[PDB]
Short mmCIF file of all heavy atoms in Angstrom, two decimals:
data_model
loop_
_atom_site.label_atom_id
_atom_site.label_comp_id
_atom_site.label_asym_id
_atom_site.label_seq_id
_atom_site.Cartn_x
_atom_site.Cartn_y
_atom_site.Cartn_z
N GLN E 1371 4.76 14.50 27.00
CA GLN E 1371 4.26 13.14 27.29
C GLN E 1371 3.29 13.16 28.45
O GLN E 1371 3.66 12.84 29.59
CB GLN E 1371 5.41 12.18 27.55
CG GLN E 1371 6.49 12.18 26.48
CD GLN E 1371 7.69 11.33 26.88
OE1 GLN E 1371 7.60 10.47 27.76
NE2 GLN E 1371 8.82 11.55 26.21
N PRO E 1372 2.06 13.60 28.23
CA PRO E 1372 1.07 13.58 29.31
C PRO E 1372 0.70 12.16 29.71
O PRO E 1372 0.92 11.20 28.97
CB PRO E 1372 -0.14 14.33 28.72
CG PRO E 1372 0.02 14.19 27.27
CD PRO E 1372 1.49 14.14 26.98
N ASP E 1373 0.15 12.03 30.90
CA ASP E 1373 -0.20 10.72 31.43
C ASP E 1373 -1.21 10.05 30.53
O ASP E 1373 -1.16 8.79 30.33
CB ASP E 1373 -0.74 10.84 32.84
CG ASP E 1373 -1.01 9.51 33.50
OD1 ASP E 1373 -0.06 8.73 33.66
OD2 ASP E 1373 -2.19 9.23 33.85
N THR E 1374 -2.18 10.77 29.98
CA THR E 1374 -3.17 10.18 29.08
C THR E 1374 -2.56 9.72 27.76
O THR E 1374 -3.24 9.01 27.02
CB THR E 1374 -4.28 11.20 28.81
OG1 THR E 1374 -3.70 12.46 28.48
CG2 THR E 1374 -5.20 11.33 30.00
N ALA E 1375 -1.30 10.10 27.48
CA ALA E 1375 -0.71 9.75 26.20
C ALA E 1375 -0.50 8.24 26.06
O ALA E 1375 -0.90 7.63 25.04
CB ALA E 1375 0.61 10.49 26.03
N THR E 1376 0.10 7.63 27.07
CA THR E 1376 0.44 6.20 27.01
C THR E 1376 -0.74 5.34 27.45
O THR E 1376 -1.79 5.84 27.88
CB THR E 1376 1.67 5.91 27.89
OG1 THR E 1376 1.39 6.36 29.24
CG2 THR E 1376 2.90 6.58 27.36
N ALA E 1377 -0.57 4.02 27.29
CA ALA E 1377 -1.61 3.06 27.64
C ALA E 1377 -1.55 2.68 29.12
O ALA E 1377 -2.57 2.74 29.83
CB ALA E 1377 -1.49 1.82 26.77
N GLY E 1378 -0.38 2.25 29.60
CA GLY E 1378 -0.18 1.96 30.99
C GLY E 1378 0.42 0.59 31.30
O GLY E 1378 0.32 -0.35 30.52
N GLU E 1379 1.08 0.52 32.46
CA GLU E 1379 1.63 -0.77 32.89
C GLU E 1379 0.55 -1.84 33.07
O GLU E 1379 0.80 -3.01 32.87
CB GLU E 1379 2.42 -0.57 34.19
CG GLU E 1379 3.67 0.25 34.03
CD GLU E 1379 4.73 -0.43 33.19
OE1 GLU E 1379 4.49 -1.60 32.74
OE2 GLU E 1379 5.81 0.17 32.98
N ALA E 1380 -0.66 -1.41 33.47
CA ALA E 1380 -1.73 -2.38 33.61
C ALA E 1380 -2.07 -2.97 32.25
O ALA E 1380 -2.24 -4.21 32.14
CB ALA E 1380 -2.97 -1.70 34.20
N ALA E 1381 -2.16 -2.16 31.21
CA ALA E 1381 -2.46 -2.69 29.88
C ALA E 1381 -1.31 -3.54 29.39
O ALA E 1381 -1.53 -4.59 28.76
CB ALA E 1381 -2.70 -1.51 28.90
N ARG E 1382 -0.06 -3.16 29.67
CA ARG E 1382 1.09 -3.97 29.23
C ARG E 1382 1.06 -5.32 29.92
O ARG E 1382 1.31 -6.37 29.27
CB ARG E 1382 2.38 -3.23 29.52
CG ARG E 1382 2.57 -1.97 28.69
CD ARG E 1382 3.85 -1.25 29.05
NE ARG E 1382 5.04 -2.05 28.78
CZ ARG E 1382 6.28 -1.61 28.79
NH1 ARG E 1382 6.53 -0.31 29.00
NH2 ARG E 1382 7.29 -2.43 28.54
N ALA E 1383 0.77 -5.37 31.24
CA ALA E 1383 0.72 -6.63 31.94
C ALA E 1383 -0.44 -7.48 31.44
O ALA E 1383 -0.31 -8.71 31.33
CB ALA E 1383 0.60 -6.39 33.42
N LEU E 1384 -1.59 -6.88 31.16
CA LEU E 1384 -2.72 -7.62 30.61
C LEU E 1384 -2.37 -8.25 29.26
O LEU E 1384 -2.69 -9.38 28.99
CB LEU E 1384 -3.92 -6.70 30.47
CG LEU E 1384 -5.27 -7.36 30.14
CD1 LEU E 1384 -5.74 -8.25 31.28
CD2 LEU E 1384 -6.30 -6.34 29.80
N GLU E 1385 -1.64 -7.48 28.41
CA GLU E 1385 -1.21 -8.01 27.13
C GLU E 1385 -0.25 -9.19 27.33
O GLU E 1385 -0.36 -10.21 26.65
CB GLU E 1385 -0.55 -6.91 26.30
CG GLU E 1385 -0.39 -7.27 24.85
CD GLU E 1385 0.26 -6.17 24.07
OE1 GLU E 1385 1.13 -5.47 24.62
OE2 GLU E 1385 -0.04 -6.01 22.86
N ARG E 1386 0.70 -9.04 28.25
CA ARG E 1386 1.64 -10.11 28.53
C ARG E 1386 0.92 -11.37 28.97
O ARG E 1386 1.23 -12.49 28.53
CB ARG E 1386 2.67 -9.69 29.57
CG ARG E 1386 3.80 -8.84 29.01
CD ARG E 1386 4.75 -8.41 30.11
NE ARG E 1386 5.98 -7.84 29.55
CZ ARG E 1386 6.12 -6.60 29.11
NH1 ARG E 1386 5.10 -5.76 29.14
NH2 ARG E 1386 7.28 -6.20 28.63
N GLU E 1387 -0.05 -11.22 29.88
CA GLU E 1387 -0.82 -12.36 30.35
C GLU E 1387 -1.61 -13.01 29.22
O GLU E 1387 -1.69 -14.24 29.12
CB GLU E 1387 -1.73 -11.98 31.50
CG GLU E 1387 -0.98 -11.58 32.77
CD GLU E 1387 -0.13 -12.73 33.33
OE1 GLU E 1387 -0.35 -13.87 32.90
OE2 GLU E 1387 0.73 -12.46 34.18
N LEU E 1388 -2.24 -12.19 28.37
CA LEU E 1388 -2.96 -12.71 27.23
C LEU E 1388 -2.03 -13.30 26.18
O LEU E 1388 -2.52 -14.01 25.27
CB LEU E 1388 -3.82 -11.63 26.58
CG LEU E 1388 -4.95 -11.03 27.44
CD1 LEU E 1388 -5.68 -9.95 26.66
CD2 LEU E 1388 -5.92 -12.11 27.86
N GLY E 1389 -0.72 -13.07 26.27
CA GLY E 1389 0.23 -13.65 25.36
C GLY E 1389 0.43 -12.87 24.07
O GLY E 1389 1.21 -13.30 23.25
N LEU E 1390 -0.26 -11.75 23.90
CA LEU E 1390 -0.14 -10.99 22.66
C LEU E 1390 1.25 -10.37 22.53
O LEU E 1390 1.78 -10.28 21.40
CB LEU E 1390 -1.19 -9.90 22.62
CG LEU E 1390 -2.64 -10.37 22.34
CD1 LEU E 1390 -3.63 -9.27 22.62
CD2 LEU E 1390 -2.77 -10.81 20.89
N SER E 1391 1.87 -9.96 23.63
CA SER E 1391 3.18 -9.35 23.59
C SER E 1391 4.08 -9.88 24.68
O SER E 1391 4.78 -9.12 25.36
CB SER E 1391 3.09 -7.81 23.68
OG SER E 1391 2.67 -7.45 24.99
N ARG E 1392 4.05 -11.19 24.89
CA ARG E 1392 4.92 -11.84 25.84
C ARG E 1392 6.05 -12.60 25.14
O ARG E 1392 7.03 -12.02 24.71
CB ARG E 1392 4.13 -12.77 26.76
CG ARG E 1392 5.01 -13.69 27.59
CD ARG E 1392 4.20 -14.41 28.70
NE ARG E 1392 3.87 -13.49 29.78
CZ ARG E 1392 3.24 -13.88 30.90
NH1 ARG E 1392 2.86 -15.13 31.09
NH2 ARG E 1392 3.00 -12.98 31.83
N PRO E 1393 19.07 -15.48 19.49
CA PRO E 1393 18.24 -14.47 20.17
C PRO E 1393 18.07 -13.20 19.36
O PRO E 1393 17.86 -12.11 19.91
CB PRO E 1393 19.04 -14.18 21.45
CG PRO E 1393 20.43 -14.48 21.09
CD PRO E 1393 20.40 -15.62 20.13
N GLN E 1394 18.16 -13.32 18.04
CA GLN E 1394 17.99 -12.21 17.12
C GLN E 1394 16.87 -12.38 16.12
O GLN E 1394 16.29 -11.39 15.67
CB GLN E 1394 19.29 -11.96 16.34
CG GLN E 1394 20.46 -11.52 17.21
CD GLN E 1394 21.72 -11.25 16.41
OE1 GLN E 1394 21.77 -11.54 15.20
NE2 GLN E 1394 22.72 -10.66 17.06
N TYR E 1395 16.54 -13.63 15.74
CA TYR E 1395 15.53 -13.91 14.72
C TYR E 1395 14.39 -14.71 15.35
O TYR E 1395 14.65 -15.68 16.06
CB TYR E 1395 16.14 -14.68 13.56
CG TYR E 1395 16.95 -13.82 12.61
CD1 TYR E 1395 18.31 -13.83 12.63
CD2 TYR E 1395 16.30 -12.99 11.70
CE1 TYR E 1395 19.07 -13.03 11.78
CE2 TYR E 1395 17.03 -12.21 10.83
CZ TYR E 1395 18.41 -12.22 10.88
OH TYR E 1395 19.15 -11.45 10.01
N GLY E 1396 13.15 -14.31 15.09
CA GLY E 1396 12.03 -14.99 15.65
C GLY E 1396 11.91 -16.41 15.18
O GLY E 1396 11.57 -17.32 15.96
N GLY E 1397 12.17 -16.66 13.89
CA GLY E 1397 12.05 -17.97 13.34
C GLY E 1397 10.78 -18.17 12.53
O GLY E 1397 10.33 -17.21 11.89
N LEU E 1398 10.24 -19.37 12.53
CA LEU E 1398 9.00 -19.64 11.79
C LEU E 1398 7.85 -18.78 12.37
O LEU E 1398 7.39 -19.02 13.45
CB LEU E 1398 8.64 -21.11 11.88
CG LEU E 1398 7.30 -21.53 11.28
CD1 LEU E 1398 7.24 -21.22 9.79
CD2 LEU E 1398 7.01 -23.01 11.53
N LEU E 1399 7.43 -17.78 11.57
CA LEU E 1399 6.37 -16.92 12.01
C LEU E 1399 4.98 -17.40 11.55
O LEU E 1399 3.99 -17.25 12.28
CB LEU E 1399 6.57 -15.51 11.49
CG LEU E 1399 7.86 -14.78 11.92
CD1 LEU E 1399 7.85 -13.35 11.41
CD2 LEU E 1399 8.04 -14.80 13.43
N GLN E 1400 4.88 -18.01 10.37
CA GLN E 1400 3.61 -18.46 9.87
C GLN E 1400 3.82 -19.69 8.99
O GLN E 1400 4.89 -19.92 8.45
CB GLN E 1400 2.88 -17.37 9.08
CG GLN E 1400 1.38 -17.57 8.95
CD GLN E 1400 0.67 -17.39 10.27
OE1 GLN E 1400 1.28 -17.08 11.28
NE2 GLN E 1400 -0.65 -17.53 10.26
N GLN E 1401 2.75 -20.50 8.86
CA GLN E 1401 2.82 -21.70 8.04
C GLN E 1401 1.43 -22.03 7.54
O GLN E 1401 0.49 -22.17 8.31
CB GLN E 1401 3.39 -22.88 8.85
CG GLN E 1401 3.38 -24.20 8.09
CD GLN E 1401 3.96 -25.33 8.90
OE1 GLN E 1401 3.33 -26.36 9.08
NE2 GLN E 1401 5.19 -25.15 9.39
N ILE E 1402 1.33 -22.18 6.22
CA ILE E 1402 0.12 -22.70 5.55
C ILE E 1402 0.42 -24.13 5.13
O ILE E 1402 1.39 -24.38 4.41
CB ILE E 1402 -0.29 -21.82 4.35
CG1 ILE E 1402 -0.20 -20.34 4.69
CG2 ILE E 1402 -1.71 -22.17 3.92
CD1 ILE E 1402 -0.57 -19.43 3.54
N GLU E 1403 -0.41 -25.06 5.58
CA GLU E 1403 -0.24 -26.47 5.29
C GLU E 1403 -1.38 -26.89 4.36
O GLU E 1403 -2.54 -26.91 4.77
CB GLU E 1403 -0.24 -27.31 6.55
CG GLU E 1403 1.06 -27.26 7.34
CD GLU E 1403 2.07 -28.26 6.88
OE1 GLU E 1403 1.93 -28.81 5.77
OE2 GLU E 1403 3.03 -28.55 7.65
N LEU E 1404 -1.05 -27.24 3.13
CA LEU E 1404 -2.03 -27.78 2.20
C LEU E 1404 -1.80 -29.31 2.14
O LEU E 1404 -1.03 -29.77 1.30
CB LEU E 1404 -1.90 -27.15 0.82
CG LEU E 1404 -2.13 -25.64 0.76
CD1 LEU E 1404 -1.68 -25.08 -0.57
CD2 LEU E 1404 -3.59 -25.31 1.02
N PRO E 1405 -2.44 -30.08 2.99
CA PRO E 1405 -2.17 -31.52 3.02
C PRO E 1405 -2.43 -32.14 1.63
O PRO E 1405 -3.44 -31.86 0.99
CB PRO E 1405 -3.17 -32.05 4.07
CG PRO E 1405 -4.14 -30.94 4.31
CD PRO E 1405 -3.37 -29.69 4.06
N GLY E 1406 -1.45 -32.92 1.20
CA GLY E 1406 -1.47 -33.49 -0.15
C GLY E 1406 -0.83 -32.60 -1.18
O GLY E 1406 -0.67 -33.03 -2.33
N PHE E 1407 -0.47 -31.34 -0.84
CA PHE E 1407 0.08 -30.41 -1.79
C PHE E 1407 1.38 -29.80 -1.34
O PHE E 1407 2.26 -29.55 -2.16
CB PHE E 1407 -0.95 -29.30 -2.09
CG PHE E 1407 -2.23 -29.80 -2.66
CD1 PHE E 1407 -3.33 -30.08 -1.86
CD2 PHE E 1407 -2.36 -29.97 -4.04
CE1 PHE E 1407 -4.51 -30.54 -2.39
CE2 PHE E 1407 -3.54 -30.43 -4.58
CZ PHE E 1407 -4.60 -30.70 -3.76
N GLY E 1408 1.54 -29.52 -0.06
CA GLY E 1408 2.84 -29.01 0.44
C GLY E 1408 2.62 -28.00 1.55
O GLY E 1408 1.62 -28.02 2.26
N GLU E 1409 3.61 -27.10 1.68
CA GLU E 1409 3.60 -26.14 2.77
C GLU E 1409 4.26 -24.83 2.30
O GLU E 1409 5.25 -24.85 1.55
CB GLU E 1409 4.32 -26.68 4.00
CG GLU E 1409 5.80 -26.84 3.85
CD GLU E 1409 6.44 -27.44 5.10
OE1 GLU E 1409 5.67 -27.84 6.02
OE2 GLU E 1409 7.67 -27.52 5.17
N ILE E 1410 3.75 -23.73 2.80
CA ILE E 1410 4.28 -22.38 2.60
C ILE E 1410 4.62 -21.83 3.98
O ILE E 1410 3.72 -21.61 4.80
CB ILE E 1410 3.29 -21.48 1.88
CG1 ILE E 1410 2.80 -22.13 0.59
CG2 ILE E 1410 3.90 -20.12 1.58
CD1 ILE E 1410 1.70 -21.36 -0.10
N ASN E 1411 5.90 -21.62 4.23
CA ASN E 1411 6.36 -21.06 5.49
C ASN E 1411 6.74 -19.62 5.32
O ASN E 1411 7.16 -19.18 4.25
CB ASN E 1411 7.56 -21.86 6.02
CG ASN E 1411 7.31 -23.36 6.09
OD1 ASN E 1411 6.16 -23.77 6.26
ND2 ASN E 1411 8.37 -24.12 5.93
N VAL E 1412 6.58 -18.83 6.41
CA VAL E 1412 7.00 -17.44 6.49
C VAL E 1412 7.91 -17.36 7.72
O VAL E 1412 7.43 -17.61 8.82
CB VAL E 1412 5.82 -16.48 6.56
CG1 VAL E 1412 6.31 -15.04 6.70
CG2 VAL E 1412 4.92 -16.62 5.35
N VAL E 1413 9.16 -16.98 7.52
CA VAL E 1413 10.20 -17.07 8.50
C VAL E 1413 10.98 -15.79 8.62
O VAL E 1413 11.26 -15.14 7.58
CB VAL E 1413 11.15 -18.26 8.21
CG1 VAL E 1413 12.33 -18.27 9.18
CG2 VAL E 1413 10.40 -19.57 8.22
#
Side-chain angles (χ1 to χ4, degrees):
Chain E
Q1371 306 174 19
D1373 185 61
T1374 47
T1376 55
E1379 293 293 358
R1382 294 178 61 168
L1384 190 67
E1385 194 181 33
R1386 280 179 167 81
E1387 292 299 345
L1388 296 178
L1390 286 166
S1391 69
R1392 168 168 285 184
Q1394 296 182 349
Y1395 282 104
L1398 173 61
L1399 300 185
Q1400 201 69 1
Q1401 176 179 126
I1402 316 180
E1403 284 273 17
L1404 299 167
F1407 299 94
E1409 70 183 6
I1410 307 174
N1411 308 331
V1412 178
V1413 174

